[PDB]
Each structure stands twice: as structure tokens, then as C-alpha cells.
Amino acid sequence: EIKIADEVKKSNKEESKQLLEVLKTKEEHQKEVQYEILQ
Amino acid sequence: LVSTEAQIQKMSQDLQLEALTIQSETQFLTGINSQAANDCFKTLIAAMLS
Amino acid sequence: LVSTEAQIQKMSQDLQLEALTIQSETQFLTGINSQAANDCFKTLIAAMLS
Amino acid sequence: GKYNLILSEYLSFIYNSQSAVQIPIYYSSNSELENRCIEFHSKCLENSKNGLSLKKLFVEYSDVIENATLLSILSYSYDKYNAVERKLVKYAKGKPLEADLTVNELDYENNKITSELFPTAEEYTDLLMDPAILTSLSSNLNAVMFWLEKHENDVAEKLKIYKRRLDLFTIVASTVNKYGVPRHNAKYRYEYEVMKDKPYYLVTWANSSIEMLMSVFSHEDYLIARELIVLSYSNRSTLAKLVSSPMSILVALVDINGTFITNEELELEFSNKYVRAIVPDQTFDELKQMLDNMRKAGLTDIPKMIQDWLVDCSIEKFPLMAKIYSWSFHVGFRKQKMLDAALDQLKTEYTEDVDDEMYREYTMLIRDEVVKMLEEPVKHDDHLLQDSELAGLLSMSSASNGESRQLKFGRKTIFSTKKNMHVMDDMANGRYTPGIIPPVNVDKPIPLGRRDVPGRRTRIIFILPYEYFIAQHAVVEKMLIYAKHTREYAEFYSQSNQLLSYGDVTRFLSNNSMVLYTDVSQWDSSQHNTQPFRKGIIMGLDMLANMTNDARVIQTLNLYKQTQINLMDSYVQIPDGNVIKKIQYGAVASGEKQTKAANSIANLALIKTVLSRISNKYSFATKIIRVDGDDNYAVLQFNTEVTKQMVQDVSNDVRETYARMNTKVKALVSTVGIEIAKRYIAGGKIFFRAGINLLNNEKKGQSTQWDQAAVLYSNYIVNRLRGFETDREFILTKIMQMTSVAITGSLRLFPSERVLTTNSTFKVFDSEDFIIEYGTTDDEVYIQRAFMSLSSQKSGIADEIAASSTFKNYVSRLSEQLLFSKNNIVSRGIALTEKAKLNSYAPISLEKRRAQISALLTMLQKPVTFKSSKITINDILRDIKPFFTVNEAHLPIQYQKFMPTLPDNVQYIIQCIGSRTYQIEDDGSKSAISRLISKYSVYKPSIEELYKVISLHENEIQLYLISLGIPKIDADTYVGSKIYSQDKYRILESYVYNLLSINYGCYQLFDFNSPDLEKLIRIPFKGKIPAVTFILHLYAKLEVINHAIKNGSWISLFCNYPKSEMIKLWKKMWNITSLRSPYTNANFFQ
């Protein structure tokens, strides 16, 4: 679940892991502040 | 074509995408794959001809 | 030589990296090791002689 | 990775039979190999259940034997009773020992036959020699014989040790085999029917002698051990007291050349200061008389060892003395009778010949000190004093064990000693009445407990009602809080988790100063802890009552006052057989919330009053005073250099000035040294007392067979660091025999190194001493995940008690006495919190822990469990490890030795990096979440609970904290403020510290703030994920330290840790499922 091309998703580079982990944190923060405002 | 990660890594380091804070700059990475480049390249020219 | 690990300490402390940010400066550390400095120092002179 | 072989050899040696078969069981984290392990298990059970040979399958599954991990070993051997003797006959070819009844003062304190002292069992009691430990004498004998047998073929210095210990065990076993072995019951007690025809004091002597001879590594050890074991068979009251007494004089003979200082509670700053030793002549005559008693007792070698040192009085030969000072306390306890132990204290000489100029000043100084403590809170009207009732009622869990009383929670009967449970009972039946303090008189005298410690007298313990605690609590907490920053309270100057344990004498030692140090443990029946002491406090309360305007506070103060009124006249129930004595004792002892600080106050006032009498004949400036319970010391500086005559005359004046208040003392004055209960100094070098009996205990606790092995291992490590070193293999044999469990009469299971040495609630020891072990592997991770799933268990007793009516009433009354109108939103929270303090009651803990061990055992038997992903510590370390690189280093020596008695590797580390200088909070006491709990309560909450509580939403934090007695407004403010985010990191720091024994054991003695350790730990900085870099630096430090300890040499490190893994670990941080046992900690200061 990420907005990026297919050769990047199946990669092993440092930058690719960095991108995936960072944007997972972005999505989780975003969903949690939505949960805040909805509660 | 240029590799997608080879350009996206450059873009990402140029934008200094902070993880913790929310930013308008993540949305710039939306739809950066290949197979869209060819779609636009094949759309514009065909439209201007037709 | 200066020890690779102490020199990397100094460089890391001097650049003020950030673990939650796609920095361009993070790539400065790739391949700093010895066994390459010797190799580069040897390669340059060997090529200029030959 | 060597223990399991010793386990196998122990099994082979102890059983030895054709019928004795040995059944390993293995596991592997890889499925296919695990099914092959399962297969091996299956086939082994079958083969065992068909009398078929097992030796054939062991080749077929070679892979499991080499790469898979062992758990345990089963053992099928029948009863085969009395085989211990059938083995033991060979090691008993020496001569047995004869008692000597005319050595001990009393009659029953001789090691004569039981029938000569208890012909009938109805008046028999094994409590005067009860080991009070769930481990057998037979265990000890089997262990010794196994060590001796396996070390029967070595040819080295080891053989020179072996001949010596073999002779010692010969001396013991000749005496034992003369009569036989007493047989333990299921409870590890020793009944009349075995001891009826045998000596009464054979068991403790035997165990103590085994422990001593197992701690022999040198010639002098053999001399000392042979000279105590043979005399401790008869003398049991005047032996450890004898040899441990001259040390107090010997410390005044060692010239300082190089010193240590204290600044704040673990700081050091060494000094090259030299100080001579101006010892007078008459103390040598005293010492000579003491050695004459020593020789008169039947001691030959150890006076000579004490005699040849005086020719030089050097500090390099001096550790022998220190070694000797620890050989006195490993002979056992002097478990005499309650009566005769009280009469060590209950001899009184109260006289109308003391001064009156002294007692009035004494009383006033106590009054003034109290006023200094209580001026600010009594005046500014602090909440914790107004609601002192509720405060004590919450803090009952941190109290003493009240007298047993018959309760009933619905449909049960309980004889609990916990006063919170007493309160629960008395609220229901209309008996709870805290404002009316009971009297203590003829109509209701007081019970007793006995505070024992070998080589000294027996102290007494009050066992009171639950009103006395409630009255004393709040006022004593503010007094202690005041004493946190006051220097002179040595029991309590700290920074919220420490004590000034390295002393504060050595600042002002010089050629011009002296120091008078004094043991004050016998000063409980004295005339200065009665009337004047209480009346000074009464006066202070009168002033303080006039120093407030609120009425709740004045009532609370009046209740504390009334408590002191009742304590001024106090009688004491003491049985003697059948009849009951009651004696007037209107004075002070332990067993109270107030006794400690108040005794410190009274000793401070006493010494301040006495020290203004030496001023009639000398000019000095009092530089420092310290008072801590059972000792106290004051340093003082002169206009000139010290002489013998000033020491002598000062000593005579001090002695007579104590006599003027009718107070006995062995007054001790010196220039370089001191001696006290917990520590002592010679030549500017701190030594310590290693007197903790391993195979014999003080009283009978409540722990299991399992946990007493862990306690014994902690005490073993401690005593080793102190200097008293026992051979580790014997200890491991004891640990395996105490963790061994009987599933049937002939089936018995024995766990392995990889179950006992893993961080959980079941950890007992470590494969390499002074080093906790972690898991880089699949397998340690696997079982840690498994055991955390099983650590959480239930107690049906607690569940049924919380469902009765009286508990519900108690929760309701707590609520409406604190806050109301949320009867189904917070009150349930308060019940869940009360559950957290029912667990102090021991049988609940036993139910729960026995349940944990049985649940553990039903997968030690059968194969292993995957445990479903629950994250733990080794999961993290597994990911930190693959980005390291080690390289050989070389650190120099620039730090000073000040604990010579350590093993040489730990000292080499201390002699290359520094000793610890801070003390960071194991409890997180300075944490902003804990400074509420220490304001409204005393309660602990364990760092597991806090680390969990912070991981939840911002809603239930309020419920959990309000449930701990805290009000609602400050909890709401704490959540709104966002201070928990400023406290995740401190809590996690304390959590990880508790998990890894960083403030518990050897690691308490090391400097992680060093510049020398840091330059090796080259982990570059990334930032804004502080937890990861924190744990990385810590773990890298632990790597270097463990390599140093285990191999002596040094190493560097380097971790260019990628940011991807930084972020992957940041999310694994606050979901940790890990835990460390309470029973595994080894506090170096007990």
C-alpha cells in the first residue's frame, strides 16, 4: 500500500526502505489525527 | 527511461520530507511511475493530430 | 591513517543529520572506508605513470 | 555453554543405576527441524515406556544434538532410599567429633542430643536450629561428594585445594556418619522423630561448615575453616562476636597513603593525602585481652595470622584481616529463645544519678529538630497532612506485618498479617475506628518479632495495630523528605534513589583531626530513648499545633501525640513455654514507621549534647556528623597535630560523659579508620562485610523452591564481590537441585542453562558471572516470547476475595472519602488498583507463582510454543547486532583501586574506566508522573505497569492514576499539559534499566558517563529518534563491558546504522513485552 512504481516496491535499496517507512508513519499520523478530531 | 527510484530518491532528498510533521510536499510523489509518462506522451500528440 | 570510525564520528557530529528526513547529506558517508583510499591513491598514480 | 555438561555428570553420579535413564529434549525455531525434534521426543518416550535402549536414536538425530537447543532432562529412577549413606561411607574414614557441654553459657545452646533437652515432642521445637530454606542437608552432601569425585583425578594447584577440602569433608562426614542423616519432610523441616537420638545443633553446623569448606582456595582459608568448623560444633553464642570485635580497633592502625572522597551520594574524587596512625597504648592492652580470650577459646592459627601483621601494620597484607572479618559471619545464626534474646535488651539500669542539665537539653534539641522538619508543611497547610487518614490508608502496603487475626471474606477464614486486610475486615463489622488509638498496657500488651543478625545481639520488633501506622505516616514522610536534602541523616540523604554509602569521613581526615565512631545498636532499653525522647516530640507537637489554623491538621497532630502518650507506657507479651510474661518497656525499638528517623534524631541530639562537653577541655570545630540507625560517627578538627594522650583523655571523657547519662558504650576513637555494621575503612580504602549465609537463612520466608535459588545466587555474587568467594560449581549444583521438580515418585525433571539464564520471571542465574546474557539467536528469542505469554497468571484466592461484600464496601468507602458520582467509571479502576496491593499477601503470590511454574512445566515436558509474535528485548537486539564491527583496542590504567577484594577482572575494569558517579532512577522517581505518586502516596507502581500505562490512550491514564489515590484535577492537568510525552523517555530508561539489572549488581559499580568508555563506542548521531541512539549506545557499552569481563581484553565498536532500521525500530519501541524477576536482583548494599 504505497504510491510508487513497482520496481521500487520490490527493491532492496536504502532509500526505498526509507521512503516506505517514512510514508507509513505519515499515513498513521494522519489517520490518528483524524481519529482525534472524530473523537 | 530514467529509473523511478533513481529519480525519486533525488527528488525526496531535494524536498527534505520530514517524517513527523505533516506537509503538502508528500503529494508531489503521487503518480510518478512509468506507464503514465507513455500515457501522456501518447495522449498529447494523438490529440493535437486529431 | 585516521581511524575510519573516529573520522565518521567527527563527520556525523559536524553535519547534523536527522533520522526522520530524507537528507541529501546522508549519502556523503557511502564508501569512506580504507582499502579504497589506498586503491584510489594507487590507481591515480599508476594511471598517470602509465 | 558448559553448565549442562555438569548437569549430566551430576545425574550420572548421583543415580548410577542401570534403571537410571537420561532423556534430553530439544527445540529449534525452524519447523522441519522442530518436527524432527518432536519425533526424537516421541520415540524417546516410547522407548522409555518399553525398556528399550535409547543410545541408537542419538546418532540418527545428530543434527538436533549439535545445532538445536536443549531445554531440560528427565530422569526415571525409583525411590532407592538411603543411597546417600551407601555412597558416603568412603568419605568418613577420619575420626568423629565430640561435643563439649561446658562451653556455651546456657544449657540448651549446647550441641547435645535432643532427648537430653526435649524428651517429649509436645514441647519440641526445631526453630532454634531450623535452616529455614527449601534445600536439604542431603542436597549439600551429595553436591560436595560429586565435586570431590569429579575433581578426584586433577593434578595441579587444584589438587592442592582438593586434598584440603577432602580432609575438611572427612572431618565433617565422620561426625555425621557416627549417627546418620536427618531426613527432610515435604516442607524441608526436620521433625522430632529423626532428631530424637541425635545432636540438636548438627544441621546448622553441618551446612555452615559445608559452605565454608566449599569457599577454600588457599592455605589460610584451610587454617581458618578448620579452626572455625571444629569449634563451632560446641560454641554457638560467643564466637562470631569474638573474632569480629577486634577489627574495630585494627582499622585505627593503617596509615592512609591515598584516599577516596564523596561529594554527592556516588561521586568520588580521590586524594593522594597521607595520614599516619596515632593509636594509644591502652587499646593495645584491650586488644591483647581480646586475643587472650581468642586463644582461651581454642584458637591457634588465626591469632598468629593476626599477630604477624602488626610487625609492619601494612595495608597490602591487610585484606587477610578483611577476609577474616568475613569468615566470622559464615558460621550461622544464633537462633536462641525469644525470652533470652529479649533479655539481651531488657536489662535496664535507670538511675536518679544522671544529669538533669543533659536530659533537658536533649529533650529540647529533639523538639527543635522536629520543628525544623515540620515548620513548612504544618504552616502552609499541605493536603497530605489534612487527609493523613486517607494517606496512611493508601500506604498500608509499605508497612510492617501486623499480628495474625482471624478474618472472613465472605466464605473463608484468613490469618493475615497485612494491615490493609485488617482494615478491610474491621470496616465491615463496625470495628474500624482510627481516631481512637488503642492503649498498650496490662489490659493489652504488645507482641514481638525478632530482628537477628549473626555476631551481634538480637534486636526486637514491635508488631502493632493499624492505627499507629496511620498516625505516624504523613508526618514521618515530610520528615524524611526534609532529610533527603539534609546531610546529617546518613540513612536518608540521597537524591531520591541512593544513600551516602561510600561515607563522608574522608574529606577532613588529616594529621590534626580525629574521628569518634560508635555503635549505638544496643541503645533501645536505654534511659535516653524513654521519657525525654517522647516528651520532646510532644513539645514539638504542641508548638506545631499552635503553628496551624485548620482543625483536621490539629486533630491529626493530636492523634500522633496520643500515639506517643500510649508509647510512653508499653507492655510486652513474651511466652516462655506455656506461661506468659509481660514486662514494662516504655521505650523505642523497630517495627514502626517512626523509629528510624526518630532514633537518628535522638542520636544526633545525644552526640551534639555530648560533643559540647569535650569543649570543656579541647578546642575543636565540629565539621561533620552522621547518624544511621545502628551506628554513628562524628569527625572533629584541632588547632594542632594529634597525640596519643589527647585520644586517651578524649576517650575517657567520652566514656564518662556517656556514663553521666547512664549509657554504656564501647567508645571508639581513631584517626584513619572506622568500623560499622555495613562497611568499614582502612587507609583511605573502603572494604565491606561479606556476611550473608547462603545455605542457612535468618527466618522463614515465603518464596518457592525456585526463587530461593535465585536469591542465593544473588547473595553468592554479592559475597564474591565483597571478598568471600565460594566455588561456583557447588552453587550451580544447588541451583539445579532446587529447580528440580518431582512429577511422580520416580520421574524428575531438570531444566537447562537456556531456560534459567533468560530475562523473564524465571531467571535464576547467568552462564558467566557478572554478565546477564541476551539473545542474538532465533531460539532465545523464541522461548522469551513463549515465557512472556506464560508469566501472566491468575490467583483464584485474589479473584474470590475481590468478589466478596467487604472488599466492595472498602472500595466504596475509599471513593466517597475521596470522590463521588462516578461509581461505575473510576471505582472499578480503584478495585483493579487494590488488586495491585493484595499481592503483598504471600499465599496469593504462591498460588500465582506455583501456577506459573506448573504452566512452565507442562511445556518443559512436551515440545515448545511459537507464542504469536509478542515483541520483547531479544527481538530488538537481534536487529541491532548485524550492523556492528569489533576491533582490538588497548585502554590504559588511570583510575584508582579502592575495592581490593574484588575479582581481578572487575577491578581491571574499575582500574581502566571509572566507577559510577550518578544514580539514574530505577523507579523513575524524579519523573513527573512519579512526583505525584510520591506526593499523594508512597506506592511503587512497578515499572512494568508504568511502561504499559504510558502506551495507552490519554483516557485510561486518568483512570489508572486517579485509582492510585491521586485526585482528578491534577491528572486531567497532567494529560492536558502533555508531560507524559516528556516522560515516555524517562519511563523507558527506567524500564530498560530494570530489565537489564543496570542498577542491580556489578553494573551498579561502573561509569557509563566515562570519556574513556565513550571514545570506544563510536556510533554516529542521527537525531530526533532519541530512544534508538540511546539503546544503541547502551547496548554497545554492554557489549564492550561483557567482552572485558569475560576475556579481560578490550575492544572498540562502530555502527553506521541505517535510518530505515532506525524507523523500523522506533515503532517497535513502545510495544515491548518483557519482564525481569524481583528475586534475581543483587543489591550490593543490603
Residue C33 phi, psi (nearest 5): -45, 155
Nearest by Cα to D479 from D304, D597, D648: D597
In whole angstroms, give the CA distance from residue D1014 to residue D1016: 5
Beta bridge partners of D73: D24, D750
Neighbours of chain D (3+ CB pairs under 8 A): A, C
Query: Collapsing DSSP states into helix, strand and coil, what is residue D887?
Result: strand
DSSP string, D861-911: SS-----TT---HHHHHHHHGGG---EE------S----TTS-HHHHHHHT
8 A C-beta contact, residue D174 and residue D116: no
Question: Domain D83-235 falls in which CATH fold?
Answer: Four Helix Bundle (Hemerythrin (Met), subunit A) (1.20.120)
Resolution (A): 4.5
Mutation target vs C (from D1031, D1054, D1057; most C CBs, 10 A cutoff):
D1054
Class of domain D921-1006: mainly alpha
D residues 1053-1082 closer than 8 Å to A (CB): 1058-1060, 1063-1064, 1067
Residue type, D685: K
In whole angstroms, give the CA distance from residue B25 to residue A25: 15
Beta bridge partners of D622: D636
Cell readout for D563 is 500515639
Query: Collapsing DSSP states into helix, strand and coil, what is residue C42?
Result: helix
Report CA D90 to chain centroid distance, whole Å: 39
CA distances from B47 to B41, B43, D271, D990, D1047 (A): 10, 6, 91, 67, 77
The residue with cell 596515632 is D278
The residue with cell 506485618 is D401
Question: Domain D236-253+279-336 falls in which CATH fold?
Answer: Arc Repressor Mutant, subunit A (1.10.10)
| Chain A / chain D CB contacts < 8 angstroms | 16
Residue type, D131: P
Judge whether A14 is closer than 8 Å to chain D, CB to CB. yes
Within 10 Å of residue D257's Cβ, how many Cβ atoms?
13
The residue with cell 482494615 is D423
Would the CA dihedral through D1060, D1066, D1069, D1071 be positive or negative? negative
8 A C-beta contact, residue D1023 and residue D738: no
Nearest by Cα to D552 from D678, D340, D384, D698: D384
In whole angstroms, give the CA distance from residue D925 to residue D613: 42
List strand residue ranges (DSSP E) for D284-349, in order: none
In whole angstroms, give the CA distance from residue D36 to residue D39: 5
CA distances from D972 to A38, B39, D355, D962, D963 (A): 20, 56, 59, 10, 13
8 A C-beta contact, residue D400 and residue D592: yes
Cell readout for D928 is 513527573
Resolved by: cryo-EM
In whole angstroms, give the CA distance from residue D1008 to residue D997: 14
Report CA D454 to chain centroid distance, whole Å: 15
Q: Which residues of A touch C22 (CB under 8 A)?
A: 15, 18-19, 22
Residue type, D485: H
Residue D678: DSSP 8-state: S
By C-alpha distance, the chain C residue nearest B8 is C22
Judge whether A32 is closer than 8 Å to chain D, CB to CB. no
In whole angstroms, give the CA distance from residue D813 to residue D817: 6
Peptide-bond breaks in chain B following residues (C–N over 2.5 A)? none
Report CA A22 to chain centroid distance, whole Å: 6
DSSP string, D685-705: -EE------SSS-SS-----H
State how far residue B21 is from chain C, nearest Cα, in angstroms. 10
Judge whether C23 is closer than 8 Å to chain B, CB to CB. yes
Burial class (CB in 10 A: 0-12, 13-18, 19+), D805: exposed
Cell readout for D408 is 472472613
8 A C-beta contact, residue D815 and residue D831: no
Q: Give ∠ CA D1029-D1035-D1039 in degrees, rounded to 5.
A: 140
Which strand (E) or helix (H) includes residue D747?
Answer: strand D747-751
Strands laid side by side in the D632-638 sheet:
D620-627, D632-638, D513-518, D668-670
Spatial neighbors of D692 by CB under 8 A, at least 6 apart, are D329, D715, D718, D719, D1086
Query: Collapsing DSSP states into helix, strand and coil, what is residue D1004?
Result: helix
Cell readout for C14 is 559536524
Residue D274 phi, psi (nearest 5): -105, 140
Spatial neighbors of D510 by CB under 8 A, at least 6 apart, are D273, D275, D637
Residue D194: HSE in the Cβ half-sphere, 13 Å Cα cutoff: 13
List strand residue ranges (DSSP E) for D520-663, in order: 571-576, 579-584, 620-627, 632-638
Cell readout for D134 is 527449601
Q: What letters, b where the CB count within 10 A reaches 16 and e where it falls short, cover D635-650?
A: bbbbeeebeeebbeeb
8 A C-beta contact, residue D1076 and residue D1034: no
8 A C-beta contact, residue D606 and residue D528: yes
Pairing of the two strands D1017-1018 and D1051-1054: parallel
Residue type, D867: K
Within 10 Å of residue D51's Cβ, how many Cβ atoms?
8
How is chain D split into domains, by residue range? 1-82+697-765+1074-1082, 83-235, 236-253+279-336, 254-278+490-519+595-696, 337-396+438-489+520-594, 397-437+766-867, 868-920+1007-1073, 921-1006
8 A C-beta contact, residue D615 and residue D591: no
Inspect the interface and report whether the beta carbons of A25 and D1067 lie closer than 8 Å. Answer: yes
Cell readout for D838 is 493484595
In whole angstroms, give the CA distance from residue A22 to residue D1064: 9
Nearest by Cα to D563 from D426, D388, D428, D345: D388
Inspect the interface and report whether the beta carbons of A16 and B5 lie closer than 8 Å. Answer: yes
Residue type, D1064: K
Query: Collapsing DSSP states into helix, strand and coil, what is residue D1033?
Result: helix
8 A C-beta contact, residue D901 and residue D1060: no
In whole angstroms, give the CA distance from residue D367 to residue D377: 16
In whole angstroms, give the CA distance from residue D479 to residue D599: 13
Residue D555: DSSP 8-state: H
Same topology between domain D83-235 and domain D921-1006: yes
Cell readout for D876 is 530488538
Tabulate helix, strand, coil % of chain A (nearest 5). Answer: 75, 0, 25
Burial class (CB in 10 A: 0-12, 13-18, 19+), D920: middle
Tabulate helix, strand, coil % of chain D (nearest 5). Answer: 45, 10, 45
Cα end-to-end distance, chain D, whole Å: 31
In whole angstroms, give the CA distance from residue D565 to residue D441: 12
CATH code linked to domain D868-920+1007-1073: 3.30.230.140
Spatial neighbors of D844 by CB under 8 A, at least 6 apart, are D795, D797, D798, D838
Residue type, D639: N
Question: Domain D254-278+490-519+595-696 falls in which CATH fold?
Answer: Alpha-Beta Plaits (3.30.70)
Query: Collapsing DSSP states into helix, strand and coil, what is residue D461?
Result: strand
DSSP string, D77-123: ----TTHHHHHHGGGG-S------TTSSSSSTTS--BGGGT-SSGGG
Beta bridge partners of D461: D449, D590
8 A C-beta contact, residue D271 and residue D696: no
Nearest by Cα to D473 from D536, D372, D560: D560
In whole angstroms, give the CA distance from residue D95 to residue D714: 36
CATH code linked to domain D337-396+438-489+520-594: 1.10.357.80
Interface of A with B (CB under 8 A): 3-8, 11, 13, 15-16, 19, 22-23, 25-26, 29-30, 33
8 A C-beta contact, residue D234 and residue D104: yes
